[PDB]
A paper describes a structure:
The outer membrane is a formidable barrier that protects Gram-negative bacteria against environmental threats. Its integrity requires the correct folding and insertion of outer membrane proteins (OMPs) by the membrane-embedded β-barrel assembly machinery ([name]). [name] is composed of a 16-stranded β-barrel, which, in [name], is preceded N-terminally by five polypeptide transport associated (POTRA) domains that extend into the periplasm. Unfolded OMPs are delivered to [name] by the periplasmic [name], but how [name] and [name] work together to ensure successful OMP delivery and folding remains unclear. The results suggest that [name] binds [name] at its soluble POTRA-1 domain, which may trigger conformational changes in both [name] and [name] that enable transfer of the unfolded OMP to the [name] lateral gate for insertion into the outer membrane.
Numbering used by the authors:
A (entry chain C): 30 to 89, 96 to 107, 109 to 210
B (entry chain P): 1059 to 1300
C (entry chain A): 100 to 175, 177 to 677, 698 to 806
D (entry chain D): 26 to 243
E (entry chain E): 25 to 109
């Protein structure tokens, strides 16, 4: 595929897991140097080709705290909601399912981001609420379940990209 | 059948939208020809200089010119030639202009033309070995030849294609054929000269490579026996090291 | 822009190292610092008409770009004098200085620029010249450079003190040295009545260090003071050497070999891991690694462990070179039918140390193939093993002209073992079948057939014969070189002799010798003379004659050059169908070729590629002849049993080690030519 | 050769054509963009894409230089696990891949260097941030590299056993078992230690290590 | 046999003069200074010290004279063991 995968030298997976060396009574093995030591470590991680190698998207007070995109300090912050309406449909054939005008409270619809990489239609839902914490009216978009090719997935990489597409749209246009 | 090898050096620099270039070179062409009553072994070794310029507008102008010393040992029975060594100098220079316009992103369309003028001393010798005088000599031959050729070149890269695929066709016609020679006989004497030619051409086969350690070669040949029983020579090889 | 004396590269690393490089901030203090520094560098070059100028160009997004203007007009050396001296002429001193004031017309050897470090080295040379000749009471009182009031001429003067001569009365040795003192005094045995020489003393400390390293002490400490008796006009040396500490190699380590395994290199290196280090052993090991020939560069490094006081580890940093290759090619053609060729020749297959050679070529004119495999280290001691199979049913049938059709094949197995530090004997057995057919009528071959008891007719051009041969062969290769390709030191001689055991159709024997030696003239080993020679002789036994096909040939690359590939030798004579002299040769039973060669680096390409290439002048001296020659038969035709008909030439040669492989290119001109020279001028052997 | 136009479009085109996989043209665009936009709003993302391109374009040394530039540029970034894993992957990829890979030749007794460096890098990663997404495959790589280094040392000890220098073998295998006590290499190297002790006339220790085999008969 | 055999040395060599310098009841640093660092050491249980002689010019009889030291876990020599063949 040559697109999103590590080199094909993946035969290292089927290596013999290490086994400890018993010390008989009457003598002791020399103390381990410990320079080449591995501790016990968790699992539940994709390995081989299933493991993902793509640069995580660095978000643009350019908020980057993962599941949140709370950027912020404009006196006309309330006017950003009609700007978001202009972004939807008009600018990019999008729509907010239930968006009040003054409240700036919206719920995103299942979209379809076909940005190559064999990434099929990705349905990302979110809640568009504009807070004013520690600054003026801030932008925030708490994403929700995404579909992509699979029925559902919750890998933080694809979730990060899914929130970051809206993040970069908002940052670029405003 | 012949083998010709040339080498040389060149110096160049850019300009305000132009890339001037010049250089010097030497060449050597050995050949062996077989006929019904004539068998010749010829060697033309010499040297010369060339120039080549191009721009960002898709136009290139090139020219070469060299002098060699053609010496040939020929065994012939008719006219009592025996085994004779005809040796003389020959200086010839040609020019050409091409326009490798960007046909697409994977090829460039190049129409080009060329014209060359060359002069060589004749073969003056006596045929007294045949019993009769039969003086054989030629005037100062000053042949010239033009040619027009179109081609398309695949500018492949990426170390996966990295080839120089090219296609097209070209026609060469003699611009001047002034090879006059004089022969003598008991009944009378005769004079001869040359005429025009309408030679065709072909393209190169593969000229392939991938990286800085692989080079692949393959040549395409044509043998148009219908016109003048012409033929060509081709080869195919590649080089790699561990 | 502006600079031309120095390539712009060293300028950009000069900027980069100082602290300013693309992408970081700007500091105008560093602007002034680097301006003055580049002026100082130009003054060191000697270009005092230099003024580096900085052009600041502001750019949006708070950027800046710096341009440099370099208006260097012209530099100057115009005067050297040695005022103060009285016993030596100035010119003989000038003959040794690196820096020269002026050089005469009929040579372009030296330039005329001024480099301060060159002056310092020249002062060192002058000091050594005076001190090693006895003048111990010598120094450099004062040296002055001077500039004319035009910034176009620089002079240099030196002021010294001659002093007086002194004699080496005697030396001694002190300090806690090794228990082997006797040989130290042996090496420091000084015979009186000889004048002083400082460089002699320096060599004394150096080789004392070498010898103590040989015993096993790797970090010694040696110094010496010349107690000078001015009243008696003599000197004595007081030397102090410490024993150091017995050092030991904890680990031996290799680094750089991507392809070759650990075992192949560890198999070398007479210096052993886990013992008392010997610098001589390490040098022998590094020379052997250089000898293997498939390492473009190897260098040794010694590093004591930061732990115990006496434990040192040695690393061998290498950079392998690509050797061996496989080739493939089809030569289709109406005049040639269908032709085909393939084959791989690799000195070190995949790095395992084995050597392999395979080829196969097919056409209507020829059908040839061969296989060859060898391991140099059958056992751990170094005995070799090799096998070779070949098939040569060429059948040059078309036109049946000036040849003789043969189908031949053979298999041989050899083994060889090393006997001393630099010699390996070789023995082996072989079997070979040959079958000759068609032939062509010409003289000097029928003698071989008649020697076997059969007398075929001479008018006919048909017929055939078969032969099987069992052979015992042996060899002896004395090799001592510095590297594996175009070396700079040593010599190598090769002996190969073959005989036939009872029960074989052929009855003969064969001997060949080769000798290539290299003699440098410069200590740095850049200009060197080269001596090649090949010798060969063989013949039949028991009243019989040696086979014609196995005979010697001469002419081509690596042989006498310029003449033709395989041209030197007596030419046959054809039977009537009276006797017609052949153009080509058939091969004499005794050949001897010699060559002397003068190597010189090419002055065009830079030092990045300099190690790769090598050009030279050469003088080919060769001659081949056949002792067996019936002079009485055709004395009317010239007699070539006498080897006096020498063939020789001279010219230039060039060798290029491309990533695609070895390349050779030679130009030569025959001088003592004869008939059938078919001379060429250039060759492109690989 | 490059359009000097506002940055939004050049970033957009850069990500779009990296999304295509046109590395030969993407590396030049990205490097020019970085050198002309040194402190853009999200230049970190630019540097990470440069890492990705360099690795996938097989220009490993310049990628290593970019890694050790980024680490000092901001030693505290919420994505340094990816950078460290990419560095270790670069080391391992640089280490072992050649015609032997087609031939399946055991690359054990080759020059380690890069293997040791890769092991150190991966170990630093895993001991740094066990909660990251690049730990499992990392741990597997640690196991594989440990096995490789142990096999290399076993091979050199085996050659010394072949020669007959029955001291250096003791030191090398002792270092093996002190460093690599939990691998197959020591498991088949112990008999070499036994043989060395038996040949060394100091069998008082020999049977001692023989008892070691008595604990792992299996 | 007949093939050339390179010289092999695989130990720490010390002459009889340093052997005479050995005496029970003194620290470890002094004995390391006197005989050199130990190229061998037992890493199991007792921290005893070994010194060995390997010397064979090639196709010739090997020469071995081992010399062993025992140390308690206090930094003082307990006993020695010389052996000349």
């Amino acid at each position: 595929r040559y697109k999103r995968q590590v080199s094909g030298d993946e035969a290292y997976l089927e290596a013999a897991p290490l086994a400890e060396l018993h010390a008989p009574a009457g003598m002791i093995l020399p103390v381990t140097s410990g320079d080449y030591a591995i501790p016990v470590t968790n699992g539940s991680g994709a390995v081989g080709k299933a493991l993902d190698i793509r640069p995580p998207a660095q978000p643009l007070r350019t908020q980057f705290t993962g599941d949140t995109a709370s950027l912020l300090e404009n006196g006309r912050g309330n006017t950003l909601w009609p700007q978001v309406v202009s972004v939807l449909a008009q600018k990019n054939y999008t729509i907010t399912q239930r968006d009040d005008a003054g409240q700036t409270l919206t719920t995103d619809w299942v979209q379809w981001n076909r940005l190559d990489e064999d990434e099929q239609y990705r349905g990302r839902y979110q809640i568009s609420v504009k807070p004013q914490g520690y600054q003026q009216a801030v932008t925030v978009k708490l994403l929700n379940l995404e579909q992509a090719g699979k029925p559902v997935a919750d890998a933080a990489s694809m979730q990060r990209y899914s929130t970051e597409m809206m993040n970069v749209i908002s940052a670029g246009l405003d | 059948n012949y083998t010709h090898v040339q080498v040389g050096v060149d110096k160049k620099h850019e300009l305000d939208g132009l890339d001037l270039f010049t250089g010097f070179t030497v060449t050597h062409t050995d050949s062996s020809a077989s006929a019904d009553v004539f068998s010749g072994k010829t060697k033309s070794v010499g040297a010369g200089l060339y120039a080549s310029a191009m721009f960002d507008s898709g136009a290139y102008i090139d020219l070469i010119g060299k002098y060699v010393h053609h010496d040939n040992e020929y065994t012939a029975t008719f006219a009592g030639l025996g085994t004779r060594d005809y040796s003389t100098h020959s200086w010839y220079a040609g020019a050409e202009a091409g326009y490798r316009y960007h046909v697409t992103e994977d090829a460039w369309i190049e129409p080009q033309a060329e014209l060359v003028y060359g002069s060589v001393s004749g073969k003056q010798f006596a045929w007294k070995d045949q019993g009769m005088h039969l003086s054989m000599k030629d005037k100062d031959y000053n042949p010239l030849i033009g040619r027009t050729g179109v081609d398309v070149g695949k500018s492949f890269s990426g170390k996966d294609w990295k080839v120089t695929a090219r296609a097209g066709l070209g026609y060469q016609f003699d611009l001047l054929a002034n090879g006059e020679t004089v022969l003598r006989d008991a009944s009378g004497e005769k004079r001869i000269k040359g005429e025009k030619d309408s030679r065709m051409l072909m393209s190169v086969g593969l000229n392939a490579e991938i990286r800085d350690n692989v080079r692949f070669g393959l040549e395409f040949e044509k043998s148009a026996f219908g016109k003048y029983n012409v033929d060509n020579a081709v080869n195919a090889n590649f080089r790699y090291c561990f | 822009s502006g600079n031309k004396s120095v390539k712009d590269d060293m300028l950009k690393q000069n900027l980069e190292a100082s602290g300013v490089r693309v992408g970081e901030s700007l500091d105008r203090t560093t602007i002034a610092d680097i301006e003055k520094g580049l002026e100082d560098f130009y003054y060191s070059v000697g270009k005092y008409s230099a003024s580096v100028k900085a052009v600041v160009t502001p750019l949006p997004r708070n950027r800046v770009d710096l341009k440099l203007v370099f208006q260097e007009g012209v530099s100057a050396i115009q005067q050297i004098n040695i005022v103060g001296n009285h016993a030596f002429t100035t010119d003989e001193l000038i003959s040794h200085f690196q820096l020269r004031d002026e050089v005469p017309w009929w040579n372009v050897v030296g330039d005329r620029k001024y480099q301060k470090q060159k002056l310092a080295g020249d002062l060192e040379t002058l000091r050594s010249y005076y001190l090693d000749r006895g003048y111990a009471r010598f120094n450099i009182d004062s040296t002055q450079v001077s500039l004319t009031p035009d910034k176009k001429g620089i002079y240099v003067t030196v002021n010294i003190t001659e002093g007086d001569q002194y004699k080496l009365s005697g030396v001694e040795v002190s300090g806690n040295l090794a228990g082997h003192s006797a040989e130290i005094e042996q090496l420091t045995k000084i015979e009186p009545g000889e004048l002083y020489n400082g460089t002699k003393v320096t060599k004394m400390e150096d080789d004392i260090k070498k010898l103590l390293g040989r015993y096993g002490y790797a970090y010694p400490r040696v110094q010496s003071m010349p107690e000078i008796n001015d009243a008696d006009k003599t000197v004595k040396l007081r030397v102090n050497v410490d024993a150091g500490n017995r050092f030991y190699v904890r680990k031996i380590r290799f680094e750089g070999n991507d392809t070759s395994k650990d075992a192949v290199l560890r198999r070398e290196m007479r210096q052993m891991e886990g013992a008392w280090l010997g610098s001589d052993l390490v040098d022998q090991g590094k020379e052997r690694l250089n000898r293997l020939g498939f390492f473009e560069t190897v260098d040794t490094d010694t590093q004591r462990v930061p732990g115990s006081p006496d434990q040192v580890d040695v690393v061998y940093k290498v950079k392998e070179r690509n050797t061996g290759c496989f080739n493939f090619g089809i030569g289709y053609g109406t005049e040639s039918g269908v032709s085909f060729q393939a084959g791989v020749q690799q000195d070190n297959w995949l790095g395992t140390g084995y050597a392999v050679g395979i080829n196969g070529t097919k056409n209507d004119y020829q059908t040839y193939a061969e296989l060859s495999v060898t391991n140099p280290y059958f056992t751990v001691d170094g005995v070799s093993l090799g096998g070779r199979l070949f098939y040569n049913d060429f059948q040059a049938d078309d036109a049946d002209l000036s040849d003789y059709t043969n189908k031949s094949y053979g298999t041989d197995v050899t083994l060889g073992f090393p006997i001393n530090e630099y010699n390996s004997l070789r023995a082996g057995l072989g079997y070979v079948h040959n079958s000759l057919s068609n032939m062509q009528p010409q003289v000097a071959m029928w003698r071989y057939l008649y020697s076997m008891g059969e007398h075929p007719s001479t008018s006919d051009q048909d017929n055939s014969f078969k032969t099987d041969d069992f052979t015992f062969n042996y060899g002896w290769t004395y090799n001592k070189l510095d590297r594996g390709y175009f070396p700079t030191d040593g010599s190598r001689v090769n002996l190969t002799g073959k005989v036939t055991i009872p029960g074989s159709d052929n009855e003969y024997y064969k001997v060949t010798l080769d000798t290539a030696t290299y003699v440098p003239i410069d200590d740095d080993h850049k200009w060197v003379v080269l001596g090649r020679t090949r010798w060969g002789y063989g013949d039949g036994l028991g009243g019989k004659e040696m086979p014609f096909y196995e005979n010697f040939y001469a002419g081509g690359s690596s042989t006498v050059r310029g003449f033709q590939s395989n041209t030197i030798g007596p030419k046959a004579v054809y039977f009537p169908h009276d006797l017609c002299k052949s153009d080509d040769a058939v091969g004499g039973n005794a050949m001897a070729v010699a060559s002397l060669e003068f190597i010189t680096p090419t002055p065009f390409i830079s030092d990045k590629y300099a190690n790769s290439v090598r050009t030279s002048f050469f003088w080919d001296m060769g001659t081949v002849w056949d002792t067996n020659w019936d002079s009485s038969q055709y004395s009317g035709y010239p007699d070539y049993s006498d080897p006096s008909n020498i063939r020789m030439s001279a010219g230039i040669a060039l060798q290029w080690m491309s990533p695609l492989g070895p390349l050779v290119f030679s130009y030569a001109q025959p001088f003592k030519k004869y008939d059938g020279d078919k001379a060429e001028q250039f060759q492109f052997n690989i | 050769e490059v359009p000097d136009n506002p940055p939004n479009e050049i970033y957009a085109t850069a990500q779009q054509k990296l999304q295509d996989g046109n590395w030969r043209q993407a590396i030049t665009q990205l490097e020019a963009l970085d050198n002309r936009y040194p402190f853009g709003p999200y230049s970190q993302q630019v540097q990470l894409d440069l890492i990705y391109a360099y690795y996938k374009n097989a220009d490993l040394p310049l990628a290593q230089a970019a890694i050790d530039r980024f680490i000092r540029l901001n030693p505290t970034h919420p994505n340094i696990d990816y950078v460290m894993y990419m560095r270790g992957l670069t080391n391992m990829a640089l280490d072992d891949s050649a015609l032997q890979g087609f031939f399946g030749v055991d690359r054990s007794d080759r020059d380690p260097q890069h293997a040791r460096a890769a092991f150190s890098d991966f170990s630093k990663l895993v001991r740094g941030y066990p909660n990251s997404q690049y730990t499992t495959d990392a741990t597997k790589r640690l196991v594989f590299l440990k096995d490789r280094l142990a096999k290399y040392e076993y091979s050199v000890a085996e050659y010394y056993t072949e020669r007959g220098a029955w001291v250096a073998v003791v030191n090398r295998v002792e270092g093996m078992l002190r460093d690599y006590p939990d691998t197959q290499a020591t498991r088949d190297a112990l008999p070499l230690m036994e043989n060395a002790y038996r040949q060394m006339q100091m069998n008082a220790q020999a049977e001692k290590v023989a008892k070691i085999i008595a604990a792992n008969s299996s | 046999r007949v093939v050339y055999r390179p010289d092999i040395n695989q130990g720490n060599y010390l002459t009889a003069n340093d052997v005479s310098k050995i005496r029970v009841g003194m620290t470890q640093q002094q004995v390391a200074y006197a005989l050199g660092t130990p190229l061998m050491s037992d890493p199991f249980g007792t921290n005893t010290w070994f010194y060995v002689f390997r010397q064979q010019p090639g196709h010739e009889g090997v020469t071995q004279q081992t010399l062993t030291l025992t140390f308690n876990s206090s930094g003082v020599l307990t006993n020695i063991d010389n052996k000349p063949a």
